[PDB]
Ligand binder design. Structure first.
Ligand SMILES: NS(=O)(=O)O[C@@H]1CCN(S(=O)(=O)[C@@H]2O[C@@H](CO)[C@@H](O)[C@H](O)[C@@H]2O)C1
Ligand SMILES: [Zn+2]
Length: 260
Protein backbone atom coordinates (compact mmCIF):
# COMPACT_ATOMS: atom_id res chain seq x y z
CA UNK A 1 0.00 0.00 0.00
CA UNK A 2 1.84 3.13 -1.43
CA UNK A 3 0.28 6.17 0.17
CA UNK A 4 -2.47 4.03 1.39
CA UNK A 5 -5.36 2.15 -0.10
CA UNK A 6 -6.84 2.63 -3.56
CA UNK A 7 -8.08 0.73 -6.60
CA UNK A 8 -4.83 -0.10 -8.35
CA UNK A 9 -3.08 -3.45 -8.74
CA UNK A 10 -0.87 -2.85 -5.73
CA UNK A 11 -3.30 -1.17 -3.33
CA UNK A 12 -6.73 -2.33 -4.48
CA UNK A 13 -9.53 -4.41 -2.92
CA UNK A 14 -7.39 -7.57 -2.71
CA UNK A 15 -4.96 -5.73 -0.43
CA UNK A 16 -7.38 -3.92 1.87
CA UNK A 17 -7.66 -6.71 4.47
CA UNK A 18 -4.06 -6.22 5.58
CA UNK A 19 -4.84 -2.81 7.07
CA UNK A 20 -8.58 -3.37 7.52
CA UNK A 21 -9.17 -6.96 8.65
CA UNK A 22 -12.94 -6.45 8.69
CA UNK A 23 -12.62 -6.68 4.89
CA UNK A 24 -13.14 -10.43 5.41
CA UNK A 25 -16.01 -9.93 7.87
CA UNK A 26 -19.53 -11.30 8.19
CA UNK A 27 -21.54 -8.49 6.56
CA UNK A 28 -19.35 -6.94 3.86
CA UNK A 29 -20.58 -4.97 0.85
CA UNK A 30 -21.24 -4.89 -2.05
CA UNK A 31 -22.92 -8.20 -2.88
CA UNK A 32 -24.52 -9.86 -5.88
CA UNK A 33 -28.29 -9.57 -5.74
CA UNK A 34 -29.72 -12.89 -6.87
CA UNK A 35 -33.20 -11.79 -7.89
CA UNK A 36 -34.67 -15.28 -7.73
CA UNK A 37 -33.38 -15.86 -4.18
CA UNK A 38 -34.40 -12.48 -2.76
CA UNK A 39 -37.68 -12.76 -0.89
CA UNK A 40 -40.58 -10.35 -1.01
CA UNK A 41 -41.25 -8.99 2.47
CA UNK A 42 -44.81 -7.65 2.84
CA UNK A 43 -43.86 -6.09 6.20
CA UNK A 44 -41.52 -3.63 4.46
CA UNK A 45 -42.92 -0.09 4.43
CA UNK A 46 -42.63 2.15 1.38
CA UNK A 47 -39.50 4.18 1.35
CA UNK A 48 -39.82 7.86 2.31
CA UNK A 49 -37.33 10.05 0.45
CA UNK A 50 -37.75 13.63 1.67
CA UNK A 51 -35.24 15.82 -0.19
CA UNK A 52 -37.34 18.97 -0.72
CA UNK A 53 -35.27 21.05 1.72
CA UNK A 54 -31.86 19.65 0.73
CA UNK A 55 -28.93 22.06 1.03
CA UNK A 56 -25.96 21.02 -1.09
CA UNK A 57 -22.73 22.85 -0.29
CA UNK A 58 -19.62 21.64 -2.04
CA UNK A 59 -18.18 19.03 -4.36
CA UNK A 60 -14.82 17.42 -3.56
CA UNK A 61 -12.38 15.18 -5.41
CA UNK A 62 -11.16 12.99 -2.55
CA UNK A 63 -8.70 10.98 -4.62
CA UNK A 64 -11.09 7.99 -4.88
CA UNK A 65 -14.31 9.50 -6.20
CA UNK A 66 -16.05 12.85 -5.90
CA UNK A 67 -18.43 13.71 -3.04
CA UNK A 68 -21.29 16.17 -3.26
CA UNK A 69 -21.70 17.31 0.35
CA UNK A 70 -24.87 18.46 2.13
CA UNK A 71 -25.74 20.46 5.22
CA UNK A 72 -26.62 17.72 7.71
CA UNK A 73 -26.87 19.95 10.79
CA UNK A 74 -30.68 19.82 10.54
CA UNK A 75 -33.32 17.41 9.18
CA UNK A 76 -33.30 18.99 5.70
CA UNK A 77 -32.89 15.96 3.46
CA UNK A 78 -33.88 12.67 5.07
CA UNK A 79 -34.58 9.04 4.35
CA UNK A 80 -37.18 7.15 6.40
CA UNK A 81 -39.48 4.16 6.16
CA UNK A 82 -38.63 1.03 4.24
CA UNK A 83 -36.55 -1.25 6.50
CA UNK A 84 -35.46 1.74 8.58
CA UNK A 85 -36.34 2.67 12.12
CA UNK A 86 -36.07 6.39 12.70
CA UNK A 87 -34.65 9.22 10.63
CA UNK A 88 -31.50 9.18 8.49
CA UNK A 89 -29.92 12.45 7.29
CA UNK A 90 -28.30 12.85 3.89
CA UNK A 91 -24.62 13.82 4.30
CA UNK A 92 -23.21 13.24 0.81
CA UNK A 93 -23.53 11.39 -2.44
CA UNK A 94 -20.90 9.92 -4.72
CA UNK A 95 -20.53 7.43 -7.55
CA UNK A 96 -18.51 4.37 -8.51
CA UNK A 97 -17.84 3.81 -12.24
CA UNK A 98 -15.83 1.83 -14.73
CA UNK A 99 -13.33 2.34 -17.53
CA UNK A 100 -15.87 0.75 -19.88
CA UNK A 101 -19.68 0.67 -19.94
CA UNK A 102 -19.78 -3.05 -19.04
CA UNK A 103 -18.39 -2.53 -15.57
CA UNK A 104 -18.43 0.00 -12.76
CA UNK A 105 -21.23 -0.83 -10.36
CA UNK A 106 -20.45 -2.34 -6.96
CA UNK A 107 -23.65 -4.29 -6.45
CA UNK A 108 -24.56 -6.64 -9.27
CA UNK A 109 -27.93 -8.06 -10.27
CA UNK A 110 -27.87 -11.74 -11.22
CA UNK A 111 -24.13 -11.13 -11.79
CA UNK A 112 -24.86 -8.22 -14.18
CA UNK A 113 -22.65 -5.18 -13.79
CA UNK A 114 -23.94 -1.72 -14.53
CA UNK A 115 -21.83 1.17 -15.89
CA UNK A 116 -21.92 2.99 -12.57
CA UNK A 117 -23.60 3.15 -9.19
CA UNK A 118 -24.79 6.18 -7.22
CA UNK A 119 -24.61 6.12 -3.41
CA UNK A 120 -26.63 8.56 -1.32
CA UNK A 121 -25.21 8.27 2.18
CA UNK A 122 -27.38 8.94 5.25
CA UNK A 123 -26.75 8.66 9.00
CA UNK A 124 -29.10 7.76 11.85
CA UNK A 125 -29.89 10.93 13.78
CA UNK A 126 -30.21 9.06 17.08
CA UNK A 127 -26.40 8.83 17.11
CA UNK A 128 -25.87 12.59 16.82
CA UNK A 129 -23.06 12.74 14.27
CA UNK A 130 -21.68 10.70 11.38
CA UNK A 131 -18.53 9.66 13.22
CA UNK A 132 -20.59 8.09 16.01
CA UNK A 133 -23.06 6.57 13.56
CA UNK A 134 -20.44 4.54 11.67
CA UNK A 135 -19.61 2.75 14.95
CA UNK A 136 -23.17 1.35 15.12
CA UNK A 137 -24.72 -1.64 13.30
CA UNK A 138 -27.66 0.55 12.26
CA UNK A 139 -25.74 3.80 11.92
CA UNK A 140 -26.01 4.41 8.18
CA UNK A 141 -28.45 3.93 5.35
CA UNK A 142 -27.07 4.06 1.85
CA UNK A 143 -29.46 4.40 -1.07
CA UNK A 144 -27.87 2.77 -4.12
CA UNK A 145 -28.96 3.50 -7.67
CA UNK A 146 -27.67 1.81 -10.81
CA UNK A 147 -26.59 3.78 -13.90
CA UNK A 148 -26.88 2.42 -17.44
CA UNK A 149 -25.71 4.20 -20.58
CA UNK A 150 -28.44 5.43 -22.92
CA UNK A 151 -30.34 8.70 -22.84
CA UNK A 152 -28.94 11.59 -20.78
CA UNK A 153 -30.03 12.27 -17.21
CA UNK A 154 -30.85 15.98 -17.15
CA UNK A 155 -30.56 16.22 -13.37
CA UNK A 156 -27.00 14.89 -13.53
CA UNK A 157 -25.67 17.52 -15.94
CA UNK A 158 -24.90 20.15 -13.32
CA UNK A 159 -22.62 17.61 -11.64
CA UNK A 160 -20.98 16.69 -14.93
CA UNK A 161 -20.18 20.27 -15.85
CA UNK A 162 -18.35 21.14 -12.61
CA UNK A 163 -15.96 18.16 -12.85
CA UNK A 164 -13.42 20.16 -14.88
CA UNK A 165 -12.93 22.35 -11.82
CA UNK A 166 -12.12 19.44 -9.49
CA UNK A 167 -9.98 17.32 -11.81
CA UNK A 168 -7.38 16.31 -9.25
CA UNK A 169 -7.26 14.97 -5.69
CA UNK A 170 -8.00 17.56 -3.01
CA UNK A 171 -9.74 20.06 -5.27
CA UNK A 172 -13.17 21.31 -4.26
CA UNK A 173 -15.75 23.70 -5.69
CA UNK A 174 -18.83 25.50 -4.44
CA UNK A 175 -21.87 23.35 -5.27
CA UNK A 176 -24.92 24.99 -3.76
CA UNK A 177 -28.58 24.65 -4.80
CA UNK A 178 -28.26 21.20 -6.32
CA UNK A 179 -31.42 19.09 -6.15
CA UNK A 180 -30.65 15.40 -5.61
CA UNK A 181 -34.24 14.47 -6.49
CA UNK A 182 -33.13 14.81 -10.11
CA UNK A 183 -30.96 11.71 -9.77
CA UNK A 184 -33.78 9.31 -8.84
CA UNK A 185 -35.61 6.86 -11.10
CA UNK A 186 -39.41 6.78 -11.26
CA UNK A 187 -39.88 3.72 -9.07
CA UNK A 188 -38.75 3.32 -5.48
CA UNK A 189 -38.98 -0.50 -5.50
CA UNK A 190 -35.88 -1.78 -3.71
CA UNK A 191 -33.82 -4.63 -2.33
CA UNK A 192 -32.40 -4.34 1.16
CA UNK A 193 -29.79 -6.14 3.26
CA UNK A 194 -27.37 -5.41 6.15
CA UNK A 195 -23.85 -4.57 4.98
CA UNK A 196 -20.83 -2.30 5.15
CA UNK A 197 -19.02 0.70 3.77
CA UNK A 198 -17.47 -0.39 0.48
CA UNK A 199 -14.18 1.47 1.01
CA UNK A 200 -11.90 1.37 4.01
CA UNK A 201 -12.58 1.46 6.89
CA UNK A 202 -15.21 -1.05 5.62
CA UNK A 203 -17.26 -0.63 8.80
CA UNK A 204 -20.28 -2.88 9.14
CA UNK A 205 -22.72 -0.11 9.85
CA UNK A 206 -24.91 0.12 6.74
CA UNK A 207 -28.47 -0.77 5.92
CA UNK A 208 -28.30 -1.05 2.15
CA UNK A 209 -31.28 0.00 0.08
CA UNK A 210 -30.68 -0.69 -3.60
CA UNK A 211 -33.27 0.50 -6.14
CA UNK A 212 -34.41 -1.93 -8.76
CA UNK A 213 -34.87 0.62 -11.52
CA UNK A 214 -31.63 2.01 -12.97
CA UNK A 215 -31.34 5.56 -14.23
CA UNK A 216 -30.02 6.21 -17.71
CA UNK A 217 -27.10 8.57 -18.31
CA UNK A 218 -25.54 9.47 -21.65
CA UNK A 219 -22.22 8.20 -22.99
CA UNK A 220 -21.00 11.81 -22.89
CA UNK A 221 -21.95 12.15 -19.23
CA UNK A 222 -20.07 9.02 -18.12
CA UNK A 223 -17.12 9.95 -20.38
CA UNK A 224 -16.69 13.10 -18.31
CA UNK A 225 -16.57 11.00 -15.10
CA UNK A 226 -13.64 9.13 -16.66
CA UNK A 227 -11.66 12.33 -17.24
CA UNK A 228 -11.20 12.86 -13.50
CA UNK A 229 -7.85 12.08 -11.87
CA UNK A 230 -6.91 9.92 -8.87
CA UNK A 231 -3.68 11.91 -8.59
CA UNK A 232 -3.08 15.39 -7.25
CA UNK A 233 -2.19 18.43 -9.34
CA UNK A 234 1.30 18.28 -10.86
CA UNK A 235 1.50 14.50 -10.60
CA UNK A 236 1.49 11.91 -13.41
CA UNK A 237 -2.05 11.41 -14.66
CA UNK A 238 -3.98 8.43 -13.36
CA UNK A 239 -7.48 8.45 -14.76
CA UNK A 240 -10.16 8.03 -12.12
CA UNK A 241 -11.80 4.86 -13.43
CA UNK A 242 -12.79 1.49 -11.96
CA UNK A 243 -13.20 2.82 -8.42
CA UNK A 244 -15.51 -0.06 -7.46
CA UNK A 245 -15.16 -2.94 -5.00
CA UNK A 246 -16.32 -6.31 -6.37
CA UNK A 247 -19.10 -8.40 -4.87
CA UNK A 248 -18.32 -9.98 -1.48
CA UNK A 249 -19.61 -13.25 0.04
CA UNK A 250 -23.23 -13.01 1.20
CA UNK A 251 -22.56 -15.37 4.12
CA UNK A 252 -25.36 -15.44 6.69
CA UNK A 253 -27.63 -12.85 5.11
CA UNK A 254 -30.97 -12.66 3.36
CA UNK A 255 -31.74 -10.01 0.76
CA UNK A 256 -35.33 -8.77 1.02
CA UNK A 257 -37.41 -7.26 -1.78
CA UNK A 258 -40.03 -4.55 -1.37
CA UNK A 259 -41.88 -5.70 -4.47
CA UNK A 260 -43.63 -8.77 -5.89
N1 LIG B 1 -19.26 3.39 -0.76
S1 LIG B 1 -20.08 3.69 0.56
O1 LIG B 1 -20.37 2.49 1.17
O2 LIG B 1 -21.28 4.44 0.35
O3 LIG B 1 -19.07 4.34 1.46
C1 LIG B 1 -18.32 5.59 1.17
C2 LIG B 1 -17.11 5.45 1.29
C3 LIG B 1 -16.83 5.64 2.77
N2 LIG B 1 -17.88 6.52 3.27
S2 LIG B 1 -17.48 7.63 4.02
O4 LIG B 1 -16.68 7.09 5.04
O5 LIG B 1 -18.64 8.36 4.37
C4 LIG B 1 -16.57 8.72 2.90
O6 LIG B 1 -15.30 8.02 2.79
C5 LIG B 1 -14.07 8.71 2.46
C6 LIG B 1 -13.33 8.19 1.29
O7 LIG B 1 -13.69 6.90 0.84
C7 LIG B 1 -14.11 10.23 2.66
O8 LIG B 1 -13.36 10.87 1.59
C8 LIG B 1 -15.35 10.99 2.79
O9 LIG B 1 -15.26 12.00 3.82
C9 LIG B 1 -16.65 10.29 2.91
O10 LIG B 1 -17.71 11.13 3.56
C10 LIG B 1 -18.70 6.62 2.34
ZN1 LIG C 1 -20.02 4.25 -2.47
Amino acid sequence: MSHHWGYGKHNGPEHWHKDFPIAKGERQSPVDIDTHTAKYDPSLKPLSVSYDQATSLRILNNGHAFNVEFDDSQDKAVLKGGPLDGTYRLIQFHFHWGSLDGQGSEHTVDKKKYAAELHLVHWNTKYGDFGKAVQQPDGLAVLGIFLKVGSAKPGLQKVVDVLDSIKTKGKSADFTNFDPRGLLPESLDYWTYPGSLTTPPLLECVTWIVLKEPISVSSEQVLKFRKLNFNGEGEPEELMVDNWRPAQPLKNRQIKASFK
